[PDB]
Amino acid sequence: EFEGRWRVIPHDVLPDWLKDNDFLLHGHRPPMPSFRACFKSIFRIHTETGNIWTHLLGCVFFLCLGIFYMFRPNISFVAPLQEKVVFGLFFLGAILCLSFSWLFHTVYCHSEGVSRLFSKLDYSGIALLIMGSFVPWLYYSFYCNPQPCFIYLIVICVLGIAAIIVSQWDMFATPQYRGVRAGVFLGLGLSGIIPTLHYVISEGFLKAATIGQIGWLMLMASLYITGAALYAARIPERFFPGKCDIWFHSHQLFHIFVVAGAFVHFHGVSNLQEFRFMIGGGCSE
Amino acid sequence: DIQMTQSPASLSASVGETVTITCRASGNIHNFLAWYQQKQGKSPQVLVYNAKTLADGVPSRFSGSGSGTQYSLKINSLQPEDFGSYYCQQFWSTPYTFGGGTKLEIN
Amino acid sequence: EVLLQQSGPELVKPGASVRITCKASGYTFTDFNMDWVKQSPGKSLEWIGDFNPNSGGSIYNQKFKDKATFTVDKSSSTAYMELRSLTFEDTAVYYCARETGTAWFAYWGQGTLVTVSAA
Ligand SMILES: CCCCCCCC/C=C/CCCCCCCC(=O)OC[C@@H](O)CO
Ligand SMILES: CCCCCCCC/C=C\CCCCCCCC(=O)OC[C@@H](O)CO
Ligand SMILES: CCCCCCCC/C=C\CCCCCCCC(=O)OC[C@@H](O)CO
Ligand SMILES: CCCCCCCC/C=C\CCCCCCCC(=O)OC[C@@H](O)CO
Ligand SMILES: CCCCCCCC/C=C\CCCCCCCC(=O)OC[C@@H](O)CO
Ligand SMILES: CCCCCCCC/C=C\CCCCCCCC(=O)O
Ligand SMILES: [Zn+2]
Numbered sequence: 167e168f169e170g171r172w173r174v175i176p177h178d179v180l181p182d183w184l185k186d187n188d189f190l191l192h193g194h195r196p197p198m199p200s201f202r203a204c205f206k207s208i209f210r211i212h213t214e215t216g217n218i219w220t221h222l223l224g225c226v227f228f229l230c231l232g233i234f235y236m237f238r239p240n241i242s243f244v245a246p247l248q249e250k251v252v253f254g255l256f257f258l259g260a261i262l263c264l265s266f267s268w269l270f271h272t273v274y275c276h277s278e279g280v281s282r283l284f285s286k287l288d289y290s291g292i293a294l295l296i297m298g299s300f301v302p303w304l305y306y307s308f309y310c311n312p313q314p315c316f317i318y319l320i321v322i323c324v325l326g327i328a329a330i331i332v333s334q335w336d337m338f339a340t341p342q343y344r345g346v347r348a349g350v351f352l353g354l355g356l357s358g359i360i361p362t363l364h365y366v367i368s369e370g371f372l373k374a375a376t377i378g379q380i381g382w383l384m385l386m387a388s389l390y391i392t393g394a395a396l397y398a399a400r401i402p403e404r405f406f407p408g409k410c411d412i413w414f415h416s417h418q419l420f421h422i423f424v425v426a427g428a429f430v431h432f433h434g435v436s437n438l439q440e441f442r443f444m445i446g447g448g449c450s451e
Numbered sequence: 452d453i454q455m456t457q458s459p460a461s462l463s464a465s466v467g468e469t470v471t472i473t474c475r476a477s478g479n480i481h482n483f484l485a486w487y488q489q490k491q492g493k494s495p496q497v498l499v500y501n502a503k504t505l506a507d508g509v510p511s512r513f514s515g516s517g518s519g520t521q522y523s524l525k526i527n528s529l530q531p532e533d534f535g536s537y538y539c540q541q542f543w544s545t546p547y548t549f550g551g552g553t554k555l556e557i558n
Numbered sequence: 559e560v561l562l563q564q565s566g567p568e569l570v571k572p573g574a575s576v577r578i579t580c581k582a583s584g585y586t587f588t589d590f591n592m593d594w595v596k597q598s599p600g601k602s603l604e605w606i607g608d609f610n611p612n613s614g615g616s617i618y619n620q621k622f623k624d625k626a627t628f629t630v631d632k633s634s635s636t637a638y639m640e641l642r643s644l645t646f647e648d649t650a651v652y653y654c655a656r657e658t659g660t661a662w663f664a665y666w667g668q669g670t671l672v673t674v675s676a677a
Contacts (some may be wrong), residue, residue, distance in 0.1 A: 168545040168617070170481065173610075175659040176589055181504075192589075196659020199501045200481035200543075485662040487603075494653060494669055495603070500662040538603060542661040546619035547593075549603040 170203035172196050174212055183278040186341050189403035193411040195275040204273050213411055216418040217271040224425035225264035231432070232257035244447035249439060252302040256435070259298020260428050266291035267421070282339070289333030289347070295424070296355050297326035299431050303358075306438035307365050307379070310449040314368075318361045322354075329354050348398035355390045358383070377441060382434045386427070393423040453477050453541055457550030463558055468529045472553045474539035476520045483543040486515060486524045489536040499524060531557055560584040562654055562667035569673045574644050578670045580637040580654035587635040588612040591657040594626065594639045597669070598650045606652075608661065609637060641672065649674045 174193045177185065181197055193213045198204060208218055235253055240246035270284035300322045308315030329350055337343060362383055366374045374380045395401070397420040403410040454477040464470050474484070482502040487495040497506045499515035502522060512533075514525040526533060534557045539550040565579035580592065594606040607618035609628040616628040625648075629638040637654055652670045655663035 170483070170543060171545075172660045173591060173657070176586070179658060197501055197504065198483075198660060199503075200483065202481055483660060483662075487663075494666040495663070496666070497662065497664050500664075501660075506664060540603070540662070545608075545617055546621070547605040547661055549605070551602050 170198070170200055170206060172198060172203065172207075181278070183281060184275060187400060187403065187415070187417070189400055189407045190411050190415055191408040197275055197277075199277055201273060201276060204276050207275075208272060211412060213415070214271050214274060216413060216415075217421050218268050220418065220421040220425065221264045221268040221271070224421075224428075225261060225268060227425070228257060228260045228264060228428065232261060242443060243439070244443055249305075252305045253435075253439075255301045256298045256432070259294040259296075260432075263291035263295035263424070263428075267424075282336070285339050286334050289338070290330050292351050292424075293326050293329040293333070293354065295428065296329075296351065297322055299428070300358065302435040303431075303438070304361060306435060306442060307361065309442060310451070311368065314361075314364060318364075321360070322357065325354055325357060344400075345398045348394040352390055352394040356387070358386075378437065379434075382430075386431060386434070389423060389427040389430070393420050393427065396420055396423070452546060453480065453544055453548050455539055455541055455548045455550040457537075457539055457553055459553060460551070461554035461556070463556040464529055466529055466531060466557060469525065469527045470529065470555065471526075472524045472537050472539075472555075474517075474522045474524070474550050476522075476541055479519050480541040480543040482518060483541060484515075484517070484522050485540045485542060486513075487538045487540065488533075489538065491535070495538065526555075529557060533557060560656070560665045562656060562665055564652075564654060564667035564670045567671040567673070569675055570644055572644055572646065572674055572676055576641045576644065576672050578639045578641075578652050578654070578672075580639070580667055582635045582637065582654075582656070587632065590659075591661070592628075592637045593655045593657060593661060593663065594628065595653040595655055595663075596622075596650045597653065598647075603653075606639065608657070611637070644672070644674045646674050648672060 172195065175196050176192045177188060177190065177194060180194055184194070184197060190213050193211070195207055195212045195214065208222070235257065236250060243249045266284070266287040270288040273284055274281050301319070304315050304318050308318070332338060332350060338347060365379070396416045400416045403415045456475045458473050462470060484502045485497060486499040488498050489495040498509050498513050499505055502517055503515040505511070505513060505515070512527045512530070514527065516523045516525065522539060524537065524539070534555055537553040537555060541548055561583045563581040563583070568576050570576055582592070588611045592609045592611060596604040596606055598604070605619050606622045606626050607616055607628060609616040609630065611630050611632060614630070618626060625641060627640040627642070629640065630636070639652065639654070641648060650672060652672060654667040656665040658664055
């Protein structure tokens with residue numbers, strides 16, 4: 167249609183609020199103050215296409231996974247109501263994170279003020295994915311140790327809310343704070359080292375390794391490090407400027423890594439409930 | 452076609468005064484509006500694009516506002532160089548249409 | 559600095575055909591679209607059409623479809639607008655303007671005056 171027509175522009179002609187990654191030389195959407203043109207742009211080829219679909223698709227994948235999990239027969243749970251509530255909080259944080267991300271990446275080029283509002287929601291979503299993911303994990307690890315379980319939930323909440331309050335700062339969105347952003351979220355996620363150490367110094371090195379928790383927590387740590395390292399350093403567009411504009415740039419890979427990370431985190435706590443279901447809800451040991 | 456209507460057809464205002472030129476569209480143009488100034492015998496020069504964004508070099512005296520079909524260009528503290536013909540343009544749909552023009556005359 | 563330099567004034571007979579030159583410089587020619595605007599004496603601006611130096615595609619205003627033709631020389635970075643079978647109504651200042659993603663014009667050629675006279 168001949169309505170709301172636009173062409174991709176090079177980086178140097180973008181306004182300062184749109185300039186973010188200088189290694190993405192061309193394929194930029196121009197400032198378009200129309201949500202009609204913004205949502206319509208989803209079907210077009212530009213820097214944001216990959217960022218958008220990885221989290222638009224990821225959002226509906228987790229929406230389906232979330233619904234399918236709530237309709238699981240209550241036979242397969244020890245406490246089906248509270249066990250569905252902890253899984254629900256993870257899926258909730260996972261859906262909100264992806265929703266805010268694909269929405270931000272879509273409306274990004276609307277206004278300087280629209281991008282300021284949705285960028286704050288984009289950062290807030292990440293913190294919600296991290297807090298929500300801890301909920302089922304602490305519930306299963308510290309099952310017959312309720313007192314420490316609830317303490318760690320207060321800790322991650324206070325750190326998660328501090329992350330949300332810091333992401334509402336204007337200087338946080340500036341490209342000079344790319345590493346600060348990666349560090350704030352990386353530290354929040356890596357704070358799981360505290361309950362992990364408690365788990366291994368209470369249940370032992372044998373029980374933590376036999377159940378797979380150690381090997382699984384190492385893979386998660388790797389995804390956090392590799393995802394932050396890529397995002398902060400801008401690899402590989404730093405090495406091939408102008409060659410990774412539409413595909414495989416650091417932000418797009420980090421997006422892929424979020425849905426991949428959230429899926430393997432679900433697989434971990436999914437095996438933690440399967441294991442608890444076999445042993446029962448009792449406290450014999 | 453999208454008929455762009457410009458009002459007033461002309462106006463004369465003293466230096467230091469605030470003036471408002473309005474512009475209407477025969478249908479929604481989704482903020483894809485631009486304002487241009489034109490000095491006699493010279494090429495037009497963009498002032499405001501995307502309804503409210505000020506172009507580089509243009510002073511803060513110029514202020515773009517509006518939404519949907521009704522738009523405005525307010526000039527605070529008129530200066531002797533602000534004389535000329537003002538034009539609004541929609542770039543939402545083809546054919547891109549311009550307003551008839553407003554003749555601003557400083558005295 | 560971006561610079562759109564247009565061809566000099568023309569004085570043509572009725573029925574003839576003019577060709578306006580638009581030398582673009584100071585940027586990568588194919589990155590942006592080029593538009594053509596007509597300004598009748600003491601009148602408002604009128605959009606003739608847009609042209610894409612990269613694809614070749616050009617969208618004309620229905621009013622001028624049978625009157626104007628947009629052509630290009632990518633090598634010299636020069637846009638052309640050819641007006642066919644001129645009439646007294648075609649006596650106007652013809653500008654070339656560059657787009658910046660969306661069709662708002664930050665860059666304008668100095669304009670070419672085409673005068674249709676019969677003496
Ligand atoms: C969060 C749930 C999923 C979201 C569904 C996707 C929504 C698709 C479209 C959204 C907005 C529709 C277009 C909104 C209206 C067109 C753009 C605009 O700003 O126009 C306002 C005009 O009236 C005046 O300029
Ligand atoms: C059960 C626990 C709660 C779960 C549901 C949480 C729902 C999400 C709530 C908040 C998201 C984080 C804050 C997001 C805040 C959005 C940015 C803002 O403050 O906008 C105001 C504008 O004027 C700025 O330009
Ligand atoms: C155990 C390490 C795991 C990986 C951590 C990676 C994230 C931290 C890295 C750097 C923090 C930078 C703090 C200082 C921030 C300075 C930002 C800057 O000047 O950036 C230069 C540009 O070329 C890039 O934007
Ligand atoms: C098993 C029951 C009895 C155990 C008593 C308490 C546990 C032993 C004492 C301290 C444990 C922590 C000591 C080490 C403290 C630092 C832990 C860490 O994050 O290490 C990072 C690595 O790169 C280097 O290790
Ligand atoms: C199985 C191990 C195989 C070897 C690979 C892993 C170990 C390699 C050793 C160290 C990793 C690199 C340490 C340095 C980590 C990168 C620092 C960084 O991201 O800085 C941010 C700024 O550059 C932003 O401008
Ligand atoms: C279930 C949780 C899986 C988490 C692993 C994902 C990869 C690591 C994520 C965040 C650490 C920091 C990297 C990104 C920070 C900046 C984000 C942004 O500004 O948009
Ligand atoms: Zn993102």
